[PDB]
Design a protein around this ligand. Sequence first.
Ligand SMILES: [Mn+2]
Lengths: 59, 295
Amino acid sequence: KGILKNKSQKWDEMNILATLSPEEREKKRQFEMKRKLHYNEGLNIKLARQLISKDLHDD
Amino acid sequence: KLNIDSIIQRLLEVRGSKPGKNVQLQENEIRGLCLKSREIFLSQPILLELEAPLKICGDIHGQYYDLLRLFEYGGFPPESNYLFLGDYVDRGKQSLETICLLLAYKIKYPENFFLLRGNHECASINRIYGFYDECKRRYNIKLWKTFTDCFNCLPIAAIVDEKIFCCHGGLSPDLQSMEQIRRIMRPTDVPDQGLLCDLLWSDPDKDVLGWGENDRGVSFTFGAEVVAKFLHKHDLDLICRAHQVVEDGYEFFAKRQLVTLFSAPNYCGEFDNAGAMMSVDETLMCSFQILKPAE
Ligand SMILES: [Mn+2]
């Protein structure tokens, strides 16, 4: 029985319970920076394109 | 003639093993998966309208062992229905096993198993962030080209019971009508700007009023009130997206009107985040199944 077609949304509050400090303030800042450093896919879009381009001009 | 049951069996054979055990499918089988899945994607809407119940997952990034842990927790198809938000390849060790199992399940249960496009399902990101290198090492560059062709046909967003809007990244300043998503033609590459780029690239940001610049150097950030207005206009209750690793696997935004889901725990051996999956039941009640970080 498929669910592809072509009610009001609530939260399981017992599940949110089951799953700020200045010392914790630091841990969060460091994660945020780690994450920003990691997400650099923007830096290399041009490069990737040129690589695809010349692999085509190979033939 | 493609043996889907055999493909799945073989991929599922490593279920008990230590993380990183490879599965070696045949080249032609992998092509088969791409061609058959591409066909199904093109035949279904680019904007999925779906019914609960279902499980929604965020980024996997080739963490195959963790993909198997998710199905273990949530139920292997068809025990449960699935919607994945993208980012299946890159970053991790086993992009191939990951996408192959997902493509195989797409083919086996085409109306109970769904895959959206992420920003990594794109040649401009794929060339560099691991997938190309993986295809070359284990098979050939031609296989990567085949995957690219498949990815270009992936659907872009889903609406669950007219209430939950799902896409990989988030909103777009250009998203005024759902019809604009429906009008996007496939196959298509991801543009550098505009609607399709934003749906896969944008981020929520607490400190931004309206639309702001994105540290990524692509697309935008959007504030809480932008989310609120959108839900109001389109008569929805929740935005569900992926795209950013978060410490507990999921994270709420804008008084719970948006949730970020990220399914790869211990993300690429660089973070020690948990991974989460969202269970949506028949009354649209949402709960979270957490994959804890390594003890
Ligand atoms: Mn992403």
